[model samples]
Target: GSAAYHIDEEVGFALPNPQENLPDFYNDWMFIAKHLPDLIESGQLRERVEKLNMLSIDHLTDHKSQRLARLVLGCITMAYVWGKGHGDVRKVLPRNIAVPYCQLSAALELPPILVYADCVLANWKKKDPNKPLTYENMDVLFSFRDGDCSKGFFLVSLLVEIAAASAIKVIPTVFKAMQMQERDTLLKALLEIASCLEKALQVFHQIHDHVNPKAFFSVLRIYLSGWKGNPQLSDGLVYEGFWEDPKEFAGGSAGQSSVFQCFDVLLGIQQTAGGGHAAQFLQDMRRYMPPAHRNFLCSLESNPSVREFVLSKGDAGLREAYDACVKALVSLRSYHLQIVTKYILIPASQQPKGTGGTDLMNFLKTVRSTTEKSLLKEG
Candidate 1:
């Protein structure tokens, strides 16, 4: 439950420990985020980040390398919008960082936080809390925007509220599946879940370009690297243990900030009730996510939904829905198998990895296998 990760003090971020056996690039993200302030002022940030932009699609295609890249992008987003609400933050990202990073996010195509916010969150007005004028018309988040400032505003929105909106489907569909004792309802709900996971994998298909290492590590790193000591934020030290120098960390990065994991938890796949390694990883990851969002997920487990339906309805009655749900889920794996072909077998030179080769495939398989076992066990 409690993750005691030793922070990268010099660079207020984190990396995989020796036991994890991940690459150096994977761990370097925190360092970059921690040092963002110094780098931005020194003028070296631009040169460094641009250097990273000179990328080969290869890294983007390989899951290992792509994971690292995605982390960097999130850090970049965090670094840019670190201390706005506090005060003195008149400008968005001080021109130098915002302009270029926005460019980088665009070419890559995955940083959907900003757009997600404008379309989904900002529009929810205090005037009419129930009706969101902007959320109803989310075309802006899903489509192209006019300028960097407008884009950055939306980007900052996603950085903060993602957790709240991520698992929306779970509460509704899962509730109907188990609560409404009608066998047809249960079957349809499960199929909806299957469709949900399939679409989850589809999200990865939109990435288009490889991130430049210089652009990612150097330019972005400086923004995320520091906290209390950052000259830009609060010249007088900010972290909790200024004396002992506590290590700082985050959960999964932007790429990981989504509803997909929530879906797995809803299905009781290696869930906390009967914990497994996958279950444990999900638990640990919550520490790094937004606290409000984290509780939203944890609360779902405590709140009972479909108990009556499960006890009263026979598995035979919902066989078709259950089968269809399982089928869509299995197809997710099949689609991933195709991903292995394009990503692993195809050479970076011709079919370059670019920004495309990332997905929640491992999680997908874990949940699918667990779901299969649970289904059979129940049968």
Candidate 2:
């Protein structure tokens, strides 16, 4: 019989929810302060997350306390540098929750993906804890070893290093397209963005093995995405400096970006509010980013140049540019599948030794199924 699957519209991707759903997962996480006392009283906090390997049909959220446990540990660690210097996106946590969270993350071993975000992607600081500092790389991180959570981060950083490079490049293309009003320039820009994504995916194919998908998703992936109002965290929590709500998850997925949002603007392809477009997933997920960065994205999102100029081209011009953007986005989606299959398709027992697979395979399959089907009409 075919296994059941789960698809989250806001998450913009599908993956299998093989076991039962623990709706209160986030609740325990959100109110971790309340439970910190009991945890401390247990006298077992140190080794709680000491050695974790959830693959081999291991769901990160499997045990009753496992998912929330790691989440609390990770979330608190995030609060430390959640919004460095540029702004404050910190969520105040009790000394109990915050301190232990960090301690345990170190105990269980730092979750892999966040290592890159904290150490490399976003600005990081080790001293003068009072104020945020400019972003800089920690030279110490390069020393991570195989099976060490930190080693794979260097590989993952390859994608963002490339992504950050494309930022200015995309901006100019959007600006020039509006100024010049040439479909050719717009196509060039879109292709460049696609090229970056394609290259990232290609690199992902190589380094992905270094990432333990279960840890990558459940542990670090949460920070990579925001509360698109996914049923997982209904209503979402608001972050510091932003009163509105759902402050992008501070740290986010390496693959998601606002490049598609820019393309929609350039081509006059309005991304529907709900999930559908290949680009829409990344757009909604942007809400999970750090406050300062998200603000920067908001600025680009309102490019009046492309908005007015592209619309002037009439439905025909709009259709052509939109299709082109779709083609590029579809290419991204195609590479995404290749990565997913590489990481998730094999049976647990037959898998290589010392490697753990994501327990979210069914959900992954379903998510891709939905995404691919939605893209078939190319909306």
Candidate 3:
């Protein structure tokens, strides 16, 4: 049997129009270029970026303009890629434009890596009280897992994770090929980048599970490899709960302990303020997890296993910690999902007044109240 195809030439899907809403940074690049005049005009660049960041938040504009601002910042990243690879002066203009554009976009919930990089470029000496860039903010980005899963963000995050893991795998080879001095510099930068991306992906995964436990856990199993089968790299970092181990929980299972140690290294990347990329990555991760889960995970540093895992490293201990952490995260998945579905999703749905039911507000109120009661009973 042949299926009938309905082809209507007149009615076609609308393509996203990128140019229609030119963000301030995208539209006035010439003006910005003129203002800065030279690439080294640090003072001028700083002033211009500060002004643009303020305008983005304060000035009233349509959502399209906001989206455009993000696109413009993306373009700036493209320019940076070019400059890094080729050292072209012509590409410098885009870099200048990207710095402020990304800063503004980050302020409004665009990509964290871009935001973190922009903050570095802006030379924000002290924490901007107004901006409040933190892991909690990153969690918000990760919390968009539903949107990402339905709209393509989840897949994007998975791709990033795979890429980071692969890059980490190749670091030794890269170092072996370089001279001593070159190796030192390259290793530092590469490791930093890899760690930052790993933390970002971790938060992303946590948020996805929090939003839709069944869907998230199902997909995670398929996307991520467990430590049991692949013992070497997986032994130290992937499976071990050692990532959260404080010094007290150091010794037990050697394989699991090694994996735990690796996890610790990754977590340690964000323990302080200097690593801009790591900070941004952690913030983005927090954005995805529900507030409760975020708090829970943040506070788990005191667990006995975490303490022991942090303390010792033998192949056996590494393996044990790896298995433990995996189990722990898996167990928490359901709890995380409940919070998101109860608090975020249901509330968002209730926002559309005319859609839910008759006497929309009253109806939503009832539904919310009922849900709260049900959750309380279950708890």
Candidate 4:
């Protein structure tokens, strides 16, 4: 049976029922998150975290609370592990953070690691309720660094998610149009998705205006780093009281975001299926996403979608519309490669693996070309 995907129009892949603060019961997590940078800067993050009272995940019954808990734990874990500035990596996570992190992750069906979903998707707020959701009015709920560059990096990513809300909302409709053989409706849906990707690309580029390349690489990037494939922490971090041995978790990477995966599934972009480090990394990243999102991608894969419909029809209009979506997606990936070159490649002065542990430049180059090849009627 094809799986079901329910996306709220207002939320899309962004956080659902987002609350600016957690409930009183979990006030400790919120307080730590707000002062995370200070604690880490003073070299007292571990000391403070070790002495903090342990909280139970049983109180977080709703999606919002559960999501907030994930975010708080993610920030603390990363800050605690990277407290020594990535030079002296910690091999064991103390029981206070380890127990609750594993507990909440198990309940939420997410990996016990800080991920793009926790930091980017579920980490945002509007400064004024009456104001628009512009970058000027928005701020991150948690951050490792508090300067404009960090704020810009995080908020710009959030805006990109917001930019794609329309395409996400119309996904089911596109599937329905295909099922009903409504060619005209399907054409409109494809064009709409294409336009939305263009908008998302535009929003993504704003990262340049907001962030300096050195700042991202030197400061913010390390906290988002993960254990797997990281030479710095080759043995992985042991979660005290949860596991007898250490566990490896991928660092937070944009690859963990479900939006592009949704686009790939809808447009039938299966380049990753043939196999590569990129392919394996992408497959692994799904486990980091919310269960429903990964299920949504699977459902789109199992069901008939736009690419198949266009191929079967051989209609000129349908082919062009479908190709437009591929082109827009390709353009976005191309710009993304440029951003990576600037932010990671150039700053590090060498090709370093991404937080997800992929051969950064080669993986992106291959994926970008593959995305372009997904275009229908391309020779």
Candidate 5:
């Protein structure tokens, strides 16, 4: 359905009016989510979660409530799993969290762990609902630290999504232009997208001004870690009472963001580095996205081919517009590589994998190179 590709003019891929609290029945989980930072700091989160009464997903009938439950439970699960010292990774999730987490995960089609959609997309509250959704008006509903660093980290990505709202709004227009063979209209839409992306890049640059690299790497990155490929948890995490065996899930990474994937599909940028691991890892991240957004991407994948249309026209103006969008994309990934270097590579002073569980340095470089190669070459 072409309707699947439709972007909400306002929220884009973000949860529209995300519930800041679940129903009162789930207040015990809310308390833990509210004081998550303090609990993790005191080394009491795991203990706290262990002692709580297991709740039912029955009360979570509303979509917002269901998402809220997932976010709260996912954060608590992260705190419980990784709150201990590095040497003490939890191999099995206790029943109190595991059952509901798995239930909510099944209901939402997301993994039973902290993910980008829960942490970034659904984790914000407007300081003033009447005000516009800008950085100044936004606050993180939950955080891993006491200060704004974590808030900044989350909101920067939020702001990036907000910035891309314009580009997403124009996607169907590009498709329409392709359908009509309207070369001029297609060029204008592509240029509009490129401009929107440049604005998005500027929003991304604010990360340096807001979040401290040391704080992000040392404190926040741990909770974002997942069980998939890390050598520390070779057996994966067992969701006690939910699954008979342990499961492997990669940590939440920016790679899971639907905005980046949307652009990749529109521009035909293929990431097949690391012997196909790069492509495989990216495809895996889609499961972490909201179902609507995932279906929208699928819709784009099957839409009239944007790259092929530009190629067949052999129109310099259309080609340049397409290349402009690709350039903006490359710049975003390039800056992301630099940011990853500062946040992960520099602090560890080692080749440790990204929170997404890949040799990100090589992965980022390969993807960026592949994006650059997608630029049209002269005959």
Candidate 6:
């Protein structure tokens, strides 16, 4: 008999559920507050502190605690911001208006937690030299590749646009509470938060190491223009005449003006790349690519484009641009892959390193099977 294998014989059991779901918000807050009792005694204060801590530690390490911390913090922040500014309006406004506002705020705010979690996880792996990183780890880190980051930014941009459109919504509530006018402390704080969010956006943007920094910067410029109160002043600062003359919005159309200006910045970036047709094609592709493919392809394409453009234009130095775009992508991808493999895929595989018995394909097949089961399930 050729190795009389019983059909009933277990070919090694699936490992018991070792990986855990992300912790719920309440539990995460309780855990931290429990650890540091004095710092978080009151529930509201504790929640606020917890959110700040989450923002602080988001990029600190890749442990379950770190991710949980980030998520809970994000939840708290969104709740607080919404409650402070839009809660009353939300109750009365029709779903069409209320839903979009809430959605935009979420898109802007949530990824800081996600990105911070990734950074933390990346740092954790770096500190642990013994355990190598892999592709699956990258997946977790790049989870926002589902357009979460862009959507977040887009939503944020929209929120700012909405702010511009209905100054009634954001200004009166925030300003009145602070007992100050539009130019007072509350607006300043709002701008400050906006600045912080922009910085966080930049941090996550690094994960897209493949895209053109100039183009990305241009995108930022466009987004900023939409949010800006004064476009003429902004134009002077970012670059002269960056905004086209036949403004996207005419007289008093601040929203249209800002959006058009943003488009122009993107156009400028494209023009610098190769001008006209190619730039349009690249930009279109960028808008539609799934988060993963966009980052990958942008990094790949940006390198040659930067090199060629720099050499041809001889305007700004090329080496810095080339190195920044290419090297950043490579480094980010490497770090990302490590986290994905170690945290996400490897445990699922259940085989320890150098065992010489495990096949990667087998592990992937398991993932696919589990995924299919998940998708097929009824609510």
Top candidate on lDDT is 5
C-alpha TM-score for every candidate: 0.43, 0.45, 0.24, 0.94, 0.94, 0.21
lDDT of 1: 0.38
Candidate 2 per-residue lDDT over residues 1-379, each given as its tens digit? 0111111211111111111122453344334322333332353322232222221112243432332344434433333332221233333323444444444344334331233323333221123334322123221112211232333544345333444244334646657675676677775665565565455445545455566765443333333433333333355443322233443232444444444443444443444243455435545555433333455455555657453554456645444544454465455556655665544344234433123334334433444444333221322
- Rank by lDDT (best first): 5, 4, 2, 1, 3, 6
Candidate 5 overall Cα lDDT vs. reference? 0.82
Model 6 Cα lDDT, one tens digit per residue, 1-379 = 0012100111101111112233343444444323322222232532443243222222323334434444333333223222322111111212222232234323333222112212221112122334322211222211112222332333222223222222212223332433433334443433433343233233444334333323323222222221123333232212112222221211111111121112122112232144454344335423321233234333333333222333444333232332332332233334434433443345444532223214433433332232223211111
Please give the range of 10 consecutive residues that has the lowest summed lDDT in model 5: 349-358
Give the TM-score comparing model 6 with the true structure, all chains together. Answer: 0.21
**Residue runs of model 4 more than 4 Å from their true location after superposition:** 1-6, 84-86, 350-358
CA lDDT of 142 in candidate 5?
91
Which parts of model 3 have CA positions greater than 4 angstroms off? Answer: 1-72, 80-85, 89-99, 102-379
Question: On residues 1-379, what C-alpha lDDT tens digit does candidate 1 reach at each position?
Answer: 1122211211111121111122443334334443545654453443444344223333344432333344344444443344321223321233333333334344444331222211223222222335432323322211111121222323233322322222243345566545554566666666665555555455434321222333322232233333333444433221221122322232123323424445445544444445566666556555544343456566656555343344345665455445544454455446645544443334333432232334334654564566555442244
Give one digit per residue, the lDDT tens place, for model 5 in 112-221. Answer: 98888888888898999999988889898898657527788888998898888888889889988888878889999999999999999998988998888777787788
Please give the distance, in angstroms, between residue 368's alpha carbon in candidate 3 and its true position after superposition: 46
lDDT of 4: 0.80
Give one digit per residue, the lDDT tens place, for model 4 in 1-379: 1224436575577775366677788888788888987887778788888887888888887878888889899888888888856586677888988999999999889988998778888888888878888988887888786552658887888788888887787777788888887989988988998988888998898998999987788778888888986787888889999999988888866677777778888898985475767788778888888888888888778887567778888698999988988898899889988898788777776433344324677888888888888877832
For model 4, which pairs clash?
none
Q: What is the Cα-based lDDT of residue 192 in candidate 4?
A: 92
- Candidate 1 ranges with C-alpha deviation above 4 Å: 1-167, 173-177, 208-244, 273-277, 305-312, 326-368, 375-378
